[PDB]
Amino acid sequence: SILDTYPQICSPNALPGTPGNLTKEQEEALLQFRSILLEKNYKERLDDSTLLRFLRARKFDINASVEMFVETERWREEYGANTIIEDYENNKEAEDKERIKLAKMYPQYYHHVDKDGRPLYFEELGGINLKKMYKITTEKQMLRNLVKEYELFATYRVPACSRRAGYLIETSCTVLDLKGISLSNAYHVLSYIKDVADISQNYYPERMGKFYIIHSPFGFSTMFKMVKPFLDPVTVSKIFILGSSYKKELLKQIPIENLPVKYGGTSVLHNPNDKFYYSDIGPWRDPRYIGPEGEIPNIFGKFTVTS
Ligand SMILES: CCCCCCCC/C=C\CCCCCCCC(=O)O[C@H](COC(=O)CCCCCCCCCCCCCCCCC)COP(=O)(O)O[C@@H]1[C@H](O)[C@H](O)[C@@H](O)[C@H](O)[C@H]1O
């Protein structure tokens, strides 16, 4: 399989329960877990990395893990997640046209990696005008975009970043920029945030590495109290709402040369004219780290900036 073309064991610093560092009990739990799924006639997504993510999410409770994995497969099938990339490719022209319009309003882009080799992801929310946004897209569509990215992450970003890092990468480093949002709108989209949380928590376990929230308005901490109800404790412990010293905290986790200038780093697009909201820069663009999976498609069509 493709798995033989990139590291399947995490770095030596990874906590037990991860690929390459299991206790005897865990390693035994994993074999039993796979056996049960194999008996249920499951074929795909049964590799160590995937299975350990579900096991970790359920603290290695085999039956709870089986139940979680079964429901995930169910959803993947009904949601169309197993063919989300293919279907997008067959509709690229139309979908790209609408995505281009949404990107400028709601920047979503990866820009290199963090110090551990994790794909570095950025989102900027301050330019969103809900009214204008609801005229060009729907929450439904934004969720499907999210799901598609989850698939692109596992398909293209992980193999490449793992080959570069020298070890298996299973998570991302996210920076949520809230500069310019109204605490009021934060409350207003609680519903969508819940939907995002449901899909991620339930179908994409152990995919969060580091998650920073910067430039949040005063009072945000209170609004966040309403988000925590639908986030597992493990997830909440990965979320960090930074203050005025955010650049210094980001510099502790991300190479200065990989962090955009406005966030405290020195990274600049090769062509200062290009926009980060049409960019997709990282190891998965480096021919040296792209494998049999091929190169990731261009989500922003012709405007896609890969440098
Ligand atoms: C309409 C625009 C709204 C965009 C507002 C959208 C904001 C969302 C922003 C970005 C999208 C998030 C992408 C997340 C990338 C990380 C990968 C990922 O999916 O991680 C997953 C995390 O799932 C999530 O919860 C994702 C949702 C994150 C919510 C972040 C809080 C949002 C902050 C709100 C800001 C306010 C918005 C301002 C509004 C202004 C707009 C005018 C898996 O977690 P992990 O710890 O890896 O494993 C879990 C496992 O899974 C559980 O089962 C187990 O029980 C548990 O023990 C663990 O094993």
UniProtKB/Swiss-Prot annotation:
It comes from the Eukaryota. InterPro entries: CRAL-TRIO_dom, CRAL-TRIO_dom_sf, CRAL/TRIO_N_dom, CRAL/TRIO_N_dom_sf, PI/PC_transfer. One of its GO terms (cellular component) is nucleus. CDD domains: SEC14. Residues 98-271 form the CRAL-TRIO domain. SUPFAM superfamilies: CRAL/TRIO domain (SSF52087), CRAL/TRIO N-terminal domain (SSF46938). GO terms for molecular function: phosphatidylcholine binding; phosphatidylinositol binding; phosphatidylinositol transfer activity. One of its GO terms (biological process) is post-Golgi vesicle-mediated transport. Present with 2870 molecules/cell in log phase SD medium. PANTHER family: CRAL-TRIO DOMAIN-CONTAINING PROTEIN YKL091C-RELATED (PTHR45657:SF1). This is CRAL-TRIO domain-containing protein YKL091C. It comes from Saccharomyces cerevisiae (strain ATCC 204508 / S288c) (Baker's yeast).
